[PDB]
Amino acid sequence: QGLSNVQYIGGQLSGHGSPRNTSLATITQCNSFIIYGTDLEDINGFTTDGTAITADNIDTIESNYLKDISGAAIVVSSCLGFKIDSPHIFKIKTLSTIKLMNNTYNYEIGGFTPDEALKYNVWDANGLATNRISGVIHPRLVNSRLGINSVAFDNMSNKLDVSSLIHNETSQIIGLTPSTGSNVPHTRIMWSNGAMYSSTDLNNGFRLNYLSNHNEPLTPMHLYNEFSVSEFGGSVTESNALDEIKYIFIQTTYANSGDGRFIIQALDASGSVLSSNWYSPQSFNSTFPISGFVRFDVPTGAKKIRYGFVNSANYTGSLRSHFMSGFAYNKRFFLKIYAVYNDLGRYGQFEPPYSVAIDRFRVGDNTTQMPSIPASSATDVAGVNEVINSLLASLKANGFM
Amino acid sequence: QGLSNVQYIGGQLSGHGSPRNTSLATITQCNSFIIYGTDLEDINGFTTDGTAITADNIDTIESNYLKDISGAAIVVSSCLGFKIDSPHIFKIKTLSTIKLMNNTYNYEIGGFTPDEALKYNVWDANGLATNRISGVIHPRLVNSRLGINSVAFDNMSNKLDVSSLIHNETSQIIGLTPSTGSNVPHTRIMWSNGAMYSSTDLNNGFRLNYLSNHNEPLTPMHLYNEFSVSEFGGSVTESNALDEIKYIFIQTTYANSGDGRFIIQALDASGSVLSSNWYSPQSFNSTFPISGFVRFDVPTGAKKIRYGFVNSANYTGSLRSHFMSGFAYNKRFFLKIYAVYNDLGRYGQFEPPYSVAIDRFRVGDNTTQMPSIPASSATDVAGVNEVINSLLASLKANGFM
C-alpha cells in the first residue's frame, strides 16, 4: 500500500498448505507496480468477511462482494500503471485471476495461462461515472473457456483484435415525416420482422410486443433478426471444424427502468432453443449513466442466433417510453453487437462489403431523390406524352437513367 | 525442455567460430519462457539431419523441413506464454529469426532488428486443425524486406494495424431466382469483367475461363478486377515518394482439389507484367479444413494490380464445382484480400466511404423495392393515365419520389 515504482522480478507467490487468503497479492494506492514473470499458484479463496469462495456459490459472490478487496489471485485497487506479463498460473480456487477496481485506469495485461480460476480470467470492477478507463488485454484471454466480464470488455481498447461488429445502428440526424424529434431510428431498415409503433409519430420508435419468457418462440410480430453460424460441409468432422462464435457482447443505452427487453437466443439445427437470455434497460450500466455492455455465452452446437427487442409485460409498448424512459438519460439511441470469434478468422469475419476497384463501393452510389412530380390528368393524347417525357428526363438527370 | 516460469534476462547467445547449430536457443514443452533484451547473433544454420541452410536451397528447406525442430535463431515448440521484447539481432544465416510450432498459441513478439535472416522474420509452423492460435507481432516486422509467412499473418490478432481490406465479399443469405441453394454469390456486382456461369442455376457461381499461365494477358471474358497504386505527381522524385503496397495477403476457402485458380498480377505503367502468381484450392490450407491465406510480393515499380478467378484447364468451369468441390468443405464462400502498406497511411488507406454528418452514409438509403405493376394495355386514353398515376404513387411511396 502507498508505494511507487515497484518491480517484482521473478520469484514466486503461492498458498501451499491451504491457508485462508483473500488473494495472493493485494495492491492498493500504488503508482506503477510491474510484475515480470512471477510464479503464481495454489490459492484457497475467501472474501474479506471470511466467506469461502467455492463453485456452488460463485454467482452469489459476484453479486454481493463486487466492491470487496478480495476474490482474485492478484487484486489491484487505485493503481496507476499496473502491468503483468505472461507467467504460468495454476490451481486458482477463487473467482478470477486479476481483479481491477477503484479507478485503476491504464492497466496492461499480458497473456498468462487462461482458464485457471472459477469464473473469469480478468474481472474488472471499476464503477464510477467520472473515471475514464482504457486497458490493453492479450487477445487469447478473451476467447477462452472463461473469458472476461462485460466491464473489462467495455474498457479494452484493443477489442477489435478479437471481435467484429455484427450489428451497428444509430439514429438519423433529420427526422422523417411525421415526427416530433430525431432521438431514435425512424424506419425498420435494419430489421427483418416487426413494425414501427405508430405511423403518426415515428419518434416513438420500434414496436415492442409481449413475450412471456426469454426462451419462448419468436413470431413475425416481434422485432428480431436471425443469422446462421458454423456452416461446414459434409467432408468435415465437427471435432475438426469447431465452433464459429464463442461470446457475444451487446452494448446499448442506459435507462433507470422499463418493461422493454433486449433478447438473444441460440438455437440448434432443428429450431429448438439451446440457450437464451434477455436484459432490462438498467442492465446496461457498465458505463453509467450513458451506455453499457452485457455478455451472452454461445453454447456449443448452436446453428442459428436470433436477437431483437420485446416487451416483458402484457401490452404493446414503444422503444421510446418502455426502453429509453422518455429520453431522460440519452438523446441518441444506438446499438452495437460484437461477436468474439472462437478462432480469429477461421470462418471469415463479418463486415461490410468493399472493393477498391469498384466505384459503387469505393465512392458510393451517386443517385439522388427525384423532385415530386404531381399526378397528371391530361387526356387529349399528348399531355400524357409530355408527362412521360418529364419523368424520363428526371430519371436520366437523377442517376437512375 | 519441460520447464516453467523461465526468465532469461540480458546475457548473450552467439555462434562465434562457426559451429554447426540448428538454432541458437531451442525451447520445447515449457510454460512461460520470457526473454528480456538478450543479445542474439552469428548463427551458422543446419537442419537436424545435418543439411546446410544456404540461400541456394532456401525454398527447398521450407518445403521439406517445415516440421523439423530447426531453422531459426530461436525455435519454440509447444510453449505456452512465449515472449521476446526487442533486442538487436544480426548475422543470422539460417531461414528465419523466430520459428513457432507445435501448438504455441499465445505468443507475443516485440520489435527486434528486422531483415537479418534469409527468408522471414517470423516463421509460423503451427499446423493442427484443433489448435486455436492467437499471437501479437510488432507491426514493423510485417512491412519489412522479408516480412512474415502466410501462417503467421493468419494467426496475428493485430493484423489491422498494418493492413486494410481491399476486397471483402461473402455469400448472400436468401438465394436469387433461379437457384438451388445460397452457398455462393449470385451476382457479379463486385466484379468489373466476366460473367456468371449459368443463368438457370445461379448457385453454380462465377464462370471460370481458360488461361494458359499466370503471366498471360487477361481479357474481358475472364473474371477479374484492376486498380492503380502509387500515384505521385510530376514534382515528386520517386526516391522520395516510395512504394504504396508491399505484401498482399489473400484468404479464401479450402477445398481438396480443383482446376480453378485465384490469380494476381502486378503490372508496370505500360501494361507489361512485372510479376504474377496463381493459387490452387488446396493452397488455402493454413487453417485447414475451412480457409487459408497466401502471400504475394509486390515488386518495386508496380503501377497496376489485377486479381481474379480463372481456370487452369482448357474448358469453361464454375466456381462451385471447380474451386469449392461441390461444397464438400464449406457451405459459405468468402474472399478477403489484405493490403500491407509500405509506409502506414502515407498514401491514405483504402476503406469504405463514410460521413457522420450525411444521413445517406450514417444510416443508409431508405428506398425499398417497388411492388410489381403488371404491364397494361388500356387504350381509351385514360387507362394509360391511371397506370401512370399508379407508377408515380409507387415511386413516391417507395422513396424514389
Residue numbers in the entry:
A (entry chain C), B (entry chain A): 505 to 905
What do the authors report?
In the present study, Klebsiella phage GH-K3-derived depolymerase Depo32 (encoded by gene gp32) was identified to exhibit high efficiency in specifically degrading the CPSs of K2 serotype K. pneumoniae. Phage depolymerases specifically recognize the glycosidic bonds on the host surface and randomly degrade them to release the repeating units (oligosaccharides) of the glycopolymers; thus, the phage particles can move closer to the cell surface and bind to host receptors. Here, GH-K3 gp32 was identified to encode a depolymerase, Depo32, which efficiently degrades the CPSs of K. pneumoniae K7 (K2 capsular type). In summary, Depo32 effectively binds and cleaves the CPSs of K2 capsular type K. pneumoniae via the putative active center constituted by Glu545/Glu423 and Asp546/Glu423 and initiates the hydrolysis process, causing the pathogens to become sensitive to elimination by the host immune system and thus achieving protective effects.
To understand the whole architecture as well as the potential modes of action of Depo32 on the K2-type CPS of K. pneumoniae, the structure of Depo32 was solved by cryo-electron microscopy (cryo-EM). Atomic models were built into the 2.46 Å nonsymmetrized and 2.32 Å C3-symmetrized maps and refined iteratively in real and reciprocal spaces. Both the nonsymmetrized and C3-symmetrized maps presented well-defined electron densities in the core region, and they all revealed trimeric architectures, similar to the overall characteristics of the previously identified tailspike proteins with known structures. In the core region of Depo32, since the resolution of the C3-symmetrized map is slightly higher than that of the nonsymmetrized map, and because of the inclusion of the potential CPS binding, catalytic and/or regulatory domains in this region, we then focused on the C3-symmetrized map and model to perform the subsequent analyses. In addition to the invisible N-terminal anchor domain and the helical-bundle domain (to residue 185) that may form the head of the spike protein, the remaining core region of the Depo32 monomer can be further split into the following domains: (i) a very short neck helix and the connection domain (residues 186–271), (ii) the β-helix domain (residues 272–642), (iii) the connection helix domain (residues 643–666), (iv) the carbohydrate-binding module (CBM) (residues 667–846), and (v) a C-terminal domain (residues 847–907). The three β-helix domains from the Depo32 trimer form a left-handed coiled β-coil architecture that is mainly mediated by polar interactions, whereas the residues inside the β-helical solenoid are highly hydrophobic. Through comprehensive inspection of the single β-helix domain or the trimer of Depo32, it was observed that both the intra- and intermolecular surface pockets were flanked by pairs of Asp/Glu residues, and the substrate oligosaccharides might associate at this location and be cleaved.
